[PDB]
């Protein structure tokens, strides 16, 4: 008796993020943005206007010393192209003080997998020069270290400040008919419990963890949640172990967007009409233990209704989505036994299923792509409630091992007590007067015959 | 109210074991769901229950078998390579691990598996059965498709489940056996993509360009059963 | 004797393909296509 | 048990009498001693005595597992009456041991 045996899907994208489309934003403090070059030109082309220029240009090899005309921001211009290395692709880094200021040229930089990224930190721009594995990480220092607005034109990647090592990796490399009979016939019976039972139990389950800054949840979902708790049933204390857990869920998912700032949601589980409320009961009453392998269980209930609300959100930018409306009812139906299978030991568990019913009003979402959402959210399902009590009557009808007040010796019972005697005064009464009833000649004739031990006692 | 009732005096049962194999033969399905309108937006495909019929004669008698295949405990990957409506990026992906089992649903008309609803013990003897992952070809108008090479998994010993739902219309009997996967090589690697090393039998080829896997199982049943 | 009860991981897929970023792609034929303008000025070039 | 929950014996409980007495023998660790064997019957009582999480019900007696039930004695009181024959060459001088 204890945790049930319920498993669930895993994390869905736990650290992997897809490569982003070409657009327009700053970079985030403590996040790494690596570049994933697609087709010749400009990667980044970051603007403050004040002093930074900077604009990543992709040169092909097994190009000679020729003055090509080159478009940046627009604007094109003459430069002269040339490679000292033709078996690698060389990553020029030009900055610049104003529009068409003086050319600052920065390498050679050299990679097998072409991966970069910029990144700055304690008010210092972090710029990799060198070739692998003899990278080096230069400082650019310049006043007006405020957030600039870069033009994306490739993929872009995410990756948090802890996994920095990892970047510095993805950068130098990247990614028949016989029975045998055990014993004789097993005596058992049948026997009906009526009891006193409440249900009682509390959803349990706060975030799991994805990538990016946090915005993204890989699995905001309910998880099964071991309880100790403490009922009076039948006006006898009980003690319980609640295992709370749902199976059948529909998982939606949610993509409103694909960038850190938007809301966008990898799995979603959503309550169903087909959906099921598993709870588990685990008593050290001898009353409930017993119920195991019972026939047939009549659960005579009533109906709870279940609501839910707005949930905190832990994010660093932005607000968090609400949830506005919603209700579900409880419904009782039949219970399950389950029968969990080690080594030769059947080891049974007790499951007991909750019908949902949805109910108006609807559950909506702000800020998403769909309303009217049907069923209690994952993220909030209590709003309010800690317990949700359902008092109701019970029938147990189960096949109980045990015999009979039978099968035991049949000389076991308390030792009756034992009868007293005649008390020795009666005695002298009545054989003093016994005396008339007493023949002459015939007892003569019996104290002629001898007597002894044996002759004594014939009717005794 | 409180008070214990007997609905019927003393009821007979006895506990036997029943040996017998089980030869076992099935086919995967999934539910391949795409996205309308272009094709190469692969949102899930996910499996599908299996359901099959077969007569087998074991060790001379033969019964008809109702099969069924279910997975519980599905693992979730994505493969992004990008966010263009032309490249290629699956939303979700359906993988299995040693976390999740597989559930054979074997109806059968035979006595011993007829009386065994309330089980006491029972023990699988089973031979592990490799099952090299297959590949599977997409449904792209134009343009070279991802190829799914090698993921075999092995079928080991996960017990069993027989559990009989106690509803107020009829006792539901829902038998179904459990099933370890156990990770092997070759692991599954998918060409022109970044992303390889992954486990489990595939969700995108059903019958993995294969007919029926075998699965030459024994079972010693311990159940209760009436007698005189 | 049939289906059963005792299920896990009922999961369902998207359908609109996810959201776009622009990007000079061509569209496909026979699919009806919505723009949703960002900023204002030139929104979508269909030209051959 | 390791796995699953453990059985418990519960109840039992007797009465003790006696009915009888002789000479017995002794000893703790060197010394050797004429003791006093008192024999006792048992009677059955009213206490109930049954091994829960099975099928073992409706027995009296007094089961061999824990008959200590916490107390580190079990108290008798009375009292016995002895004539021991002394040799007295006279009618003095006594021996007591």
Redesign the interface.
Known sequence: ?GPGE????????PL????????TFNPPVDYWMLLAPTTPGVIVEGTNNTDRWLATILIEPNVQSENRTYTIFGIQEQLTVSNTSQDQWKFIDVVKTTANGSIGQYGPLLSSPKLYAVMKHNEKLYTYEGQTPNATTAHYSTTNYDSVNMTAFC?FYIIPRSEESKCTEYINN???????????????????????ITIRFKFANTIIKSGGLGYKWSEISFKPANYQYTYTR?GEEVTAHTTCSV???????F????LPTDFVV??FEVIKE?S?VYIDYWDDS?AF?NVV??????ANLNSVMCTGGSYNFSLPVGQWPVLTGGAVSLHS??????????D???LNSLRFRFRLAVEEPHFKLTRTRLDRLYGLPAADPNNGKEYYEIAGRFSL?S?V?????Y???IA????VRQDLERQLGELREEFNALSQEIAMSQLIDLALLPLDMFSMFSGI
């Open positions: 008796w319920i498993n669930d899907s895993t994390t869905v994208g992997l993020d897809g490569p982003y489309q070409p657009t993929d990247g990614l028949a008919n016989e029975d045998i009979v055990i014993s004789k016939t097993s005596l058992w019976k049948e026997m009906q419990y009526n009891r006193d039948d199976n059948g869920m529909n998982d939606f998912s993509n409103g967007g694909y990898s799995k087909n099921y001898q233990r392998y019972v026939r047939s269980l009549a139906a039949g219970v399950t036994l389950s029968t969990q299978f080690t030769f030991v059947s009808i096949l091992p045990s015999n009979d007040d099968q035991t010796p076991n019972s308390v030792t």
